[PDB]
Design an enzyme around this catalytic site. Structure first.
Site, PDB file in Angstrom:
ATOM      1  N   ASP A   1      -6.294   8.179  -0.452  1.00 29.95           N
ATOM      2  CA  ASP A   1      -5.778   7.162   0.478  1.00 29.95           C
ATOM      3  C   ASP A   1      -4.603   7.788   1.254  1.00 29.95           C
ATOM      4  OD1 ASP A   1      -7.353   5.379  -1.056  1.00 29.95           O
ATOM      5  OD2 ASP A   1      -5.648   4.022  -1.532  1.00 29.95           O
TER       6      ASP A   1
ATOM      7  N   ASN B   1      -7.659   8.986  -5.696  1.00 33.26           N
ATOM      8  CA  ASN B   1      -8.464   8.024  -6.434  1.00 33.26           C
ATOM      9  C   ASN B   1      -9.286   8.761  -7.492  1.00 33.26           C
ATOM     10  OD1 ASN B   1      -8.857   6.849  -3.176  1.00 33.26           O
ATOM     11  ND2 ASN B   1      -7.792   5.732  -4.680  1.00 33.26           N
TER      12      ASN B   1
ATOM     13  N   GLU C   1       0.826  -1.208   0.000  1.00 25.90           N
ATOM     14  CA  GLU C   1       0.000   0.000   0.000  1.00 25.90           C
ATOM     15  C   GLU C   1       0.861   1.259   0.000  1.00 25.90           C
ATOM     16  OE1 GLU C   1      -3.232   0.341  -0.353  1.00 25.90           O
ATOM     17  OE2 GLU C   1      -3.948  -1.715  -0.159  1.00 25.90           O
TER      18      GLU C   1
ATOM     19  N   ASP D   1     -12.428   8.617  -8.006  1.00 24.50           N
ATOM     20  CA  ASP D   1     -13.686   9.144  -7.432  1.00 24.50           C
ATOM     21  C   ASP D   1     -13.479  10.458  -6.684  1.00 24.50           C
ATOM     22  OD1 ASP D   1     -12.629   8.259  -5.026  1.00 24.50           O
ATOM     23  OD2 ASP D   1     -14.353   7.002  -4.475  1.00 24.50           O
TER      24      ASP D   1
ATOM     25  N   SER E   1     -11.697  10.732  -3.811  1.00 24.54           N
ATOM     26  CA  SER E   1     -11.193  10.392  -2.489  1.00 24.54           C
ATOM     27  C   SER E   1      -9.665  10.263  -2.556  1.00 24.54           C
ATOM     28  CB  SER E   1     -11.840   9.105  -1.983  1.00 24.54           C
ATOM     29  OG  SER E   1     -11.456   8.008  -2.729  1.00 24.54           O
TER      30      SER E   1
ATOM     31  N   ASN F   1      -8.761   5.274   3.226  1.00 28.13           N
ATOM     32  CA  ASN F   1      -9.442   6.104   2.246  1.00 28.13           C
ATOM     33  C   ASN F   1     -10.501   7.035   2.830  1.00 28.13           C
ATOM     34  OD1 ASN F   1     -11.848   6.185   0.065  1.00 28.13           O
ATOM     35  ND2 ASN F   1      -9.897   6.274  -0.937  1.00 28.13           N
TER      36      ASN F   1
END
Ligand SMILES: [Cl-]
Ligand SMILES: [Cl-]
Ligand code: NA
Length: 129
Positions: free
Chosen positions: A52, A46, A35, A48, A50, A59
């Protein structure tokens, strides 16, 4: 902070992730490797909108507040910036809520695709724990 492998394993163990919801420590170390590359300051946007955050790439759609993810929740009740700290407490506490939410560690895309089903014990091999 960029953790070493065994240094992160030790921190995660101290904070109660070893075998949390049945997920051995190596699962958590593996997830963090893929990650964030063990970097607490990792951030990734991301599609969308959002983002992380941190060592476990938690997220903002659900788990933390960053002020820029419309319609999102903050289920861990924390600013997303708290997930970037050299102290992994906030990330661990939030990860515990995530992994308890029904789907286990499948919430972590890199875990599902790169760790699940593999010899995750390799990630803690040789560490003093
Ligand atoms: Cl928001
Ligand atoms: Cl599970
Ligand atoms: Na949010």
């Amino acid at each position: 902070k960029v953790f070493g492998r065994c240094e992160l394993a030790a921190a995660m163990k101290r904070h109660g992730l070893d075998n949390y919801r049945g997920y051995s420590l190596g699962n958590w170390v593996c997830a963090a490797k893929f990650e964030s590359n063990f970097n607490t300051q990792a951030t990734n946007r991301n599609t969308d909108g959002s983002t992380d955050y941190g060592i476990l790439q938690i997220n903002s759609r659900w788990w933390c507040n960053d002020g820029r993810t419309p319609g999102s929740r903050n289920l861990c009740n924390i600013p997303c910036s708290a997930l970037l700290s050299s102290d992994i407490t906030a990330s661990v506490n939030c990860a515990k809520k995530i992994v308890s939410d029904g789907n286990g560690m499948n919430a972590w895309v890199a875990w599902r695709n790169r760790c699940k089903g593999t010899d995750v014990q390799a990630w803690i091999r040789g560490c003093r724990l």
